[PDB]
Amino acid sequence: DCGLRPLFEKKSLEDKTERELLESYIIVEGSDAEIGMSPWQVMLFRKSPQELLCGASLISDRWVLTAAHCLLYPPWDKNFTENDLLVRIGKHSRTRYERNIEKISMLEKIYIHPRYNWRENLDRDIALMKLKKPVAFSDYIHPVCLPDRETAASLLQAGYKGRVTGWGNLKEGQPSVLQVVNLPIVERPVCKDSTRIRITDNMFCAGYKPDEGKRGDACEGDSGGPFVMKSPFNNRWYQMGIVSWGEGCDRDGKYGFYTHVFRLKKWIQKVIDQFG
């Protein structure tokens, strides 16, 4: 039942911009998310001091996906343990406690990819978090699907648009509610030529180039969030990427880089069945 939103697909209602995504299959400069638009959106919350740590996504009733750098990043002296954080699911407002809507879960264990490269280019920027108890699904809490080889091959193409969501900075400035933006996947050569950082096959970049006019990008605080696409084949939402890194936010000539979820699916599956 993954990728089918209770307030949209399940009731045959479309959100205001999903059409833009479909037409392409041939947070800075975003907008307020609609209620129940990204039911898999998760907020990584730091216990003390209470503050936004990163975004994340719900992939089952007991597993949450995020970017490895959100939990481990030596350059900024970041090395969180499971007891240092909380997972807030089903949220819309950034700072308010959404009683009767959101659910706060504790972390049982954190799993960082063994070959995550924090010292150079954030290669394999991915991590899994097992919750102590399963969260109950609702209109505002629902898992997103993970892509299979065919899904990735068909939708991970230059020009095809995905959607990124998060409570991060609005400019390189904090939003009241969850922000959303649809961005086109950019061809590899362009991504590589826009930076001095080495790009790998475990990442893809997205965003508009200066000649396109439109803008948009993830920013600090959005890391760990999902880059999703709605399959035109089965009408389900798939998490194709994880907000990873970018030079600044929404700068002309630059692009946001996302962890290639399918490429690391092997690792994801291994961790899942090995640990419950």
Binding site: K47, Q50, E51, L86, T95, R96, Y97, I104, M106, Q174
Partner: peptide, 10 residues
């Protein structure tokens, strides 16, 4: 500037 969550969670 975050509200404050129920004590059970903390």
């Amino acid at each position: 500037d975050f509200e404050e969550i129920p004590e059970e969670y903390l």
